[PDB]
Design a protein around this ligand. Structure first.
Ligand SMILES: [Zn+2]
Ligand SMILES: [Zn+2]
Ligand SMILES: [Zn+2]
Lengths: 53, 52, 51
């Protein structure tokens, strides 16, 4: 475009789309690790509950 | 609008905003979920700490 | 710009980019906290291994 403002807004939209995709990917990764943490903590509580006298 | 280029820009802007809102919600929920996981791990160690 | 549509698009594009930055920072914080939670759950199981 011959319009500087139009080129800038196009750049902003593209940069925003890419960043959003990356942020969602990272959020899902965090949720996966969060689940791993919860599962391992439950494992510890189960081992404690199943201890022999 | 009959300006084709302006229409494409409108579409790109709308998609970008929609995705940013989607990612903002995802990130907010994930931070909260991570705190819950931190609390769960802390509670497991607490049970080990308080056992006689 | 005397063109209202162009101004509105310029604003919306900048706002989307700012919101994406916010989401990036929050996602990064969540990954860090989740990792710390994983490490602490591992600490609990290690303590049990030594009993
Ligand atoms: Zn240009
Ligand atoms: Zn049109
Ligand atoms: Zn203007």
């Amino acid at each position: 475009s011959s319009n500087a403002k139009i080129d800038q807004l196009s750049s902003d939209a593209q940069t925003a789309n890419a960043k959003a995709d990356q942020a969602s990917n990272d959020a899902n990764a965090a949720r996966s690790d969060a689940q791993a943490a919860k599962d391992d903590a439950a494992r510890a509580n189960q081992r404690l509950d199943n201890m022999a006298t």
